[PDB]
Design an enzyme around this catalytic site. Sequence first.
Site, PDB file in Angstrom:
ATOM      1  N   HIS A  10      27.634 -16.218  90.726  1.00  0.00           N
ATOM      2  CA  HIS A  10      27.005 -14.924  90.403  1.00  0.00           C
ATOM      3  C   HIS A  10      25.540 -14.820  90.794  1.00  0.00           C
ATOM      4  O   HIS A  10      24.982 -13.727  90.694  1.00  0.00           O
ATOM      5  CB  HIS A  10      27.055 -14.635  88.909  1.00  0.00           C
ATOM      6  CG  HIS A  10      28.422 -14.421  88.383  1.00  0.00           C
ATOM      7  ND1 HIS A  10      29.300 -13.526  88.964  1.00  0.00           N
ATOM      8  CD2 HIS A  10      29.069 -14.969  87.322  1.00  0.00           C
ATOM      9  CE1 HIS A  10      30.434 -13.538  88.277  1.00  0.00           C
ATOM     10  NE2 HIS A  10      30.312 -14.389  87.272  1.00  0.00           N
ATOM     11  N   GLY A  23      24.837 -14.051  84.882  1.00  0.00           N
ATOM     12  CA  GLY A  23      26.007 -14.743  84.373  1.00  0.00           C
ATOM     13  C   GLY A  23      25.848 -16.250  84.275  1.00  0.00           C
ATOM     14  O   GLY A  23      26.744 -17.014  84.665  1.00  0.00           O
TER      15      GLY A  23
HETATM   16  C1  LIG Z   1      29.437 -12.012  79.727  1.00  0.00           C
HETATM   17  O1  LIG Z   1      28.860 -13.264  80.145  1.00  0.00           O
HETATM   18  C2  LIG Z   1      29.512 -14.071  81.053  1.00  0.00           C
HETATM   19  C3  LIG Z   1      29.003 -14.103  82.348  1.00  0.00           C
HETATM   20  C4  LIG Z   1      29.599 -14.886  83.328  1.00  0.00           C
HETATM   21  C5  LIG Z   1      30.711 -15.656  83.011  1.00  0.00           C
HETATM   22  C6  LIG Z   1      31.386 -16.462  84.089  1.00  0.00           C
HETATM   23  O2  LIG Z   1      31.943 -17.526  83.840  1.00  0.00           O
HETATM   24  N1  LIG Z   1      31.384 -15.907  85.310  1.00  0.00           N
HETATM   25  O3  LIG Z   1      31.920 -16.477  86.467  1.00  0.00           O
HETATM   26  C7  LIG Z   1      31.240 -15.615  81.719  1.00  0.00           C
HETATM   27  C8  LIG Z   1      30.654 -14.827  80.725  1.00  0.00           C
HETATM   28  N2  LIG Z   1      31.200 -14.864  79.469  1.00  0.00           N
HETATM   29  C9  LIG Z   1      30.643 -15.687  78.557  1.00  0.00           C
HETATM   30  O4  LIG Z   1      29.504 -16.098  78.710  1.00  0.00           O
HETATM   31  C10 LIG Z   1      31.324 -16.201  77.313  1.00  0.00           C
HETATM   32  C11 LIG Z   1      31.952 -15.384  76.372  1.00  0.00           C
HETATM   33  C12 LIG Z   1      32.544 -15.955  75.235  1.00  0.00           C
HETATM   34  C13 LIG Z   1      32.494 -17.337  75.021  1.00  0.00           C
HETATM   35  C14 LIG Z   1      33.108 -17.999  73.818  1.00  0.00           C
HETATM   36  C15 LIG Z   1      33.010 -19.399  73.697  1.00  0.00           C
HETATM   37  C16 LIG Z   1      33.566 -20.054  72.600  1.00  0.00           C
HETATM   38  C17 LIG Z   1      34.218 -19.291  71.626  1.00  0.00           C
HETATM   39  C18 LIG Z   1      34.322 -17.900  71.731  1.00  0.00           C
HETATM   40  C19 LIG Z   1      33.765 -17.250  72.831  1.00  0.00           C
HETATM   41  C20 LIG Z   1      31.854 -18.136  75.963  1.00  0.00           C
HETATM   42  C21 LIG Z   1      31.274 -17.572  77.092  1.00  0.00           C
HETATM   43 ZN   LIG Z   2      34.090 -16.683  85.101  1.00  0.00          ZN
END
Ligand SMILES: COc1ccc(C(=O)NO)cc1NC(=O)c1ccc(-c2ccccc2)cc1
Ligand SMILES: [Zn+2]
Length: 386
Positions: free
Chosen positions: A141, A149
């Site tokens: 990203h 991200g």
């Molecule tokens: C919106 O932000 C993002 C941006 C980019 C990415 C990604 O991997 N992109 O390729 C992923 C996220 N989502 C999270 O950060 C996230 C949400 C939820 C959790 C979570 C973890 C443990 C328990 C419950 C929820 C962990 C991470």
């Molecule tokens: Zn992802």
Amino acid sequence: SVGIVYGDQYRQLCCSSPKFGDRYALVMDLINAYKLIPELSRVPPLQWDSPSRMYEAVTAFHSTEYVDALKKLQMLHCEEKELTADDELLMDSFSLNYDCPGFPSVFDYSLAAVQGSLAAASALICRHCEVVINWGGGWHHAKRSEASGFCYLNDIVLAIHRLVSSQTRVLYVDLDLHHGDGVEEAFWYSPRVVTFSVHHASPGFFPGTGTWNPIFLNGAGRGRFSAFNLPLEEGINDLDWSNAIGPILDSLNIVIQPSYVVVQCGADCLATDPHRIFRLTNFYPLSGYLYAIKKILSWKVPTLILGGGGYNFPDTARLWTRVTALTIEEVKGKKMTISPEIPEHSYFSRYGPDFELDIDYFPDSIQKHHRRILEQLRNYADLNKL
Ligand SMILES: COc1ccc(C(=O)NO)cc1NC(=O)c1ccc(-c2ccccc2)cc1
Ligand SMILES: [Zn+2]
Ligand SMILES: [K+]
Ligand SMILES: [K+]
């Protein structure tokens, strides 16, 4: 050989961030617990002879001022004296905030994955390895001057740029839950780097791209038609995801004839990821990821396999251990027999409550996307005389 990027410092740095904590250590210690390490060539992360060389490597994509901002942010976080108004403004102008905050090792930590993926590319170019794995990489990203991200530096862009600047064509295949927008944007204008992202997309869902805009945007200038996107609805299982992507991948390979494939294998599509968007498994009787990777490896093109998302850390390790074993198998031609039970090792207690390698889960829109994409492949080929 099959290469895999690791090292003592590299491990400490990949485990130094507040979002991903020790995920990378679980991954590499699960790979080691299953005795896969003696089958793999160790690829050491790249190091430079000077600040200037490091700077020239990273600013092949990122802007110098963004790189200066990220270094200053680390130093600011090595105090506890919090930021001034001017430094907060400065960080804000690079989205070094919110989802991408500072922390004490943020620049070193970000640079580590770049060093890893640039060594991976070098081992492929120099013919040392047929396939190289970097599970500390896959930060798809990050933009030229913007963190996004929790990606701060785009190791994939840089590694692909090293590959193409070694007619070299690169096919980038992005299996992460999330659209690979930074890699797509980096190569928006580049026909020799064809990007293909399959992902969830829906209103409000990060990052927002990789879907209708209504028609698909797909490149500009000589890059027209060279960016491919397959957005899928929530809830998809291994077999439906496999049928959606498999003929696309196969067509991509037939037509583009890539010199290298770069695969981002983010694990957040697993049924057991906290996202709970996709229903994919790590099952190997079939795992959407094992199907796609094995397909891609049956091509016999030199291939970079990278990590990515994955927020259930033990399940990301179950998946990537299997990807790692499959690769050894499909490249060396020698069977890897994985116990369905997790072996004792330092993180054994993280694999409760069952301690099995299988994740603990019980398992025409696409045809229209197929004809759209197959027509877009037609335009790319006629545009590029293939
Ligand atoms: C919106 O932000 C993002 C941006 C980019 C990415 C990604 O991997 N992109 O390729 C992923 C996220 N989502 C999270 O950060 C996230 C949400 C939820 C959790 C979570 C973890 C443990 C328990 C419950 C929820 C962990 C991470
Ligand atoms: Zn992802
Ligand atoms: K993706
Ligand atoms: K492109």
